Amino acid sequence: PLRRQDVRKTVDKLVEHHIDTQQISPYILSRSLEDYVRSFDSHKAYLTQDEVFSHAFSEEATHPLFKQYQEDNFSSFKELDTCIQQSISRAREWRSSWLTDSIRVIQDKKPSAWASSIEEVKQRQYDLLLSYASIYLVKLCIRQIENHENPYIGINDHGYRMSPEEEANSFHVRIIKSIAHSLDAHTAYFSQEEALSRVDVSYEPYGNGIIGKITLHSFYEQVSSEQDLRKAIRELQEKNLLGLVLDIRENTGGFLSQAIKVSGLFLTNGVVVVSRYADGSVKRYRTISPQKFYDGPLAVLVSKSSAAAAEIVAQTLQDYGVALIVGDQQTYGKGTIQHQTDFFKVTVGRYYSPSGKSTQLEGVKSDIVIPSRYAEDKLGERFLEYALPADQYDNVINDNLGDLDINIRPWFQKYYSPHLQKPELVWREMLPQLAHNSQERLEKNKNFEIFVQHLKKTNKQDRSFGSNDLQMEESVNIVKDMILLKSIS
Amino acid sequence: AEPLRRQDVRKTVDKLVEHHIDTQQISPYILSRSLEDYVRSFDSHKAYLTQDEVFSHAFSEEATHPLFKQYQEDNFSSFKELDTCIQQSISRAREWRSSWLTDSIRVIQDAKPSAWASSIEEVKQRQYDLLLSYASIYLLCIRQIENHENPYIGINDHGYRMSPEEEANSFHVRIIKSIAHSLDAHTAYFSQEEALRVDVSYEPYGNGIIGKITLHSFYENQVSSEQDLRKAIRELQEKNLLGLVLDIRENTGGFLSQAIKVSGLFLTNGVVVVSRYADGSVKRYRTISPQKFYDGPLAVLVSKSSAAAAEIVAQTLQDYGVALIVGDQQTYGKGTIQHQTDFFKVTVGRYYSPSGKSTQLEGVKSDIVIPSRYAEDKLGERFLEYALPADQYDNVINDNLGDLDINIRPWFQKYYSPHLQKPELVWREMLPQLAHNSQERLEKNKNFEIFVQHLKKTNKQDRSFGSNDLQMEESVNIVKDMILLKSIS
């Protein structure tokens, strides 16, 4: 199936629900041609810049796509899939001669620019197998770089060449997946064929009480992220809980449903997160009794790998000023919404915190910087190939209850609005004092001084920074300061 | 220069025992030890003699019974007998070495007992195991290990055989030094041939800082340990000095005059240290204006190596309860005074803390235990030969003025007694809360638990405990609790 005409109808099912773009344009197409050459190959060893350019970026290559797309032609694309074969044919053969001298092969870089000279295309295709070769630490190997090279032939799962009609899928599947990507970073296309269908807890003694350390790896869902934290915090309160550090440095996300649930543990009433979509808006409220489960100093420890769901919690607990966000200066920065539907996984709406500030290309900003593992690594959505720009929404901290029906809306006014959570000042007030001490503590810490060098690869001299969690130890020290500072106010 | 006759040794000793603390008369008991110390001074590893050769020449009544009376007659037979036997084994062990030299390549092989060997062969192995020891550290010896024994056989530094007097000279010296050692641990003779600051750092804590100060010694120019401390503290008081750690882990003593002045920076008025010589007693007052130089929480970090003036400061500050002693379970235990006068050092008296407790041999006890690098090692006064026993003296915290002449007390009744330093209770009450938190914090720390293993050499895998002072980091944490525990009161 999947004849040439299937693609134009396939995408119009998608674009109508897409978040920012709802109509194809040559701007989308020029990159639709690029993602074709970036899904294959991600190592840039098959082609020459000149060869890439003339077939991927020449005006003869870039601007006839329209109207060709509407026209279903795909010649500029078909020559590219013809041009790759020539590069493909060259690769295999080069390797055939090395099979002969295999013993020599055994002996033991993404410029975003392909090699200018063909003999340099040689050397890297030559230095390509070295990746999979040196991981151990050939026949078994050579297939691992060919199985993903073969869909441009029409190959079966196991190796047999299939009919042109089932060879027609791959050229047309990889023209649509190369389209879904160009719209934005978080949308790929899924074929039916591809559509086959907890919490660490520790504490440290301090004064006549303790400081809680809780690591949450993801928002999952009587056992959930909300439930286990409740179990932990309550168990800690047996000991005199004086402060709390919340670790989401490795939280790669989870249920939005749980992000609201966790956030409500440190809030009384009010909006937690807002998301518009293509049309409308929904302010996902949080309603709880006057009691907050944990009412005290709270430090949220994050990293560049902290995710959307984690960022939503961090950004929201920051706007209400019940939590100081410590860790890397900026979180991952994922603030978009993706949904299913075969098969599309498309970005449809933007996330917003109660203050209307978004986490889309900038993340949750840290009030106190504590560099994590990924500090010197370029990690974040901003570096994904097609990431959407940042926006902001109206501030909703004081809720007008303005997005409801007038049957329920009065009910809020009487019982939800008067006990609305007021953003706090006490913790963000002592912030310039806390940031000063942290900076001084880190500079005077030898282990942390080493850890910084170690990230910058300037640790020519070999030093060890111990076996303690350095990012956590500082966060504990920040909470120790918060407690004492409050105790003298 | 001058050699020494038989009659000289006794004359020199009489000069040595004139103002000794516990012994002013040479008894046979003291002489028996001097003969025992003679072999041990020569043979440290017990690798030259047999049990009997040892036992018969020193330990036997033929060896040790006639000692006292012979000594009065200025005769030293048993020493000459022993020295002769020493000379035999030396010559005996050297003709063994000569053969070991021929086959030297084999010697390069690197594949303290309670009692001497009960057979020549058992010695012959230890003598061989000695070469093992010297070669094993590598990672020649035949001459290096001769230097110790050469002056026993009449061989000088350069190796030329000395005159009968020059041999009798060195022989008499070795006797005297052995009689000296046998009086007590710190009395020593020196033959006429022999012989011829403050680290400051701070850690930020809340709206102020905690000061770390390392005092390597009590030195007394324009600079002393006291003045450097005053300057250190005053510079620290520019920032808000909330707490203070005083480090003396590697302090081995120094001037008593500085110990009095250092300890008086944290005390208002009263006795700091009491001295008792063979006759009479002295009270070292500290009269400062009621203004303490430093008024606040104070942790004093100590170790097994800390002595002896360092102990005086540590225990005096402990008795008034202005300082908590943290560190090793016990200090060195040096609680005696050495006078220096062809010169010798005589232990002439004992020191006492104001409460009347001696630092010997029990040392100063830490209120909170933070094991140092000597934690597994056996280090203290009690492990030295002929160490003197522990004593006790009257308490003086309520100062009699009884040691002053009766016509000078009027001043001290008028301006000194009404303002005595009263022992403080504020900090010693925190002790159980502090000791509990300190114990838990260490056990929950990975680096410190690795460090403890590293001491017992249980760190089979090479795990690093980091490049930070673990004992200081904890000492700061103890002060951090002390500040909070006071802020709530």
Brief descriptors of the model:
Carboxy-terminal processing protease, 6-stranded mixed sheet, EC 3.4.21.-, hydrolase, 489 residues, Ser/Lys/Gln catalytic triad, alpha/beta, homodimer, 4-stranded antiparallel sheet, 2 domains, 12% strand, dimeric
- Taken in chain order, the helices and strands of chain A follow as HHHHHHHHHHHHEEHEHEEEHEEEEHHHHH
Largest interface: A-B, 29 and 29 residues
Task: Please estimate the helix content of chain A.
Answer: 25-40%
Dominant shape of chain A: globular
- Give the N-terminus to C-terminus distance of chain A in angstroms: 74 Å
Instruction: Report the biggest beta sheet of chain A as strand number plus sense, adding barrel if it closes.
Output: 6 strands, mixed
Number of extended strands of chain A:
10
- Tally of helical runs of chain A: 20
Tell me which oligomeric state these chains represent: homodimer
| Strands in their spatial order, largest beta sheet of chain A | 1-2-3-6-7-10
Rg of chain A: 27 Å
Tell me the count of domains of chain A: 2
Q: In what range is the share of β-strand residues of chain A? A: 5-15%
Structural class of chain A: alpha/beta
PDB class: hydrolase
Keywords: Ser/Lys/Gln catalytic triad, Chaperone
Assembly: dimeric
Entry title: Structure of C. trachomatis CT441
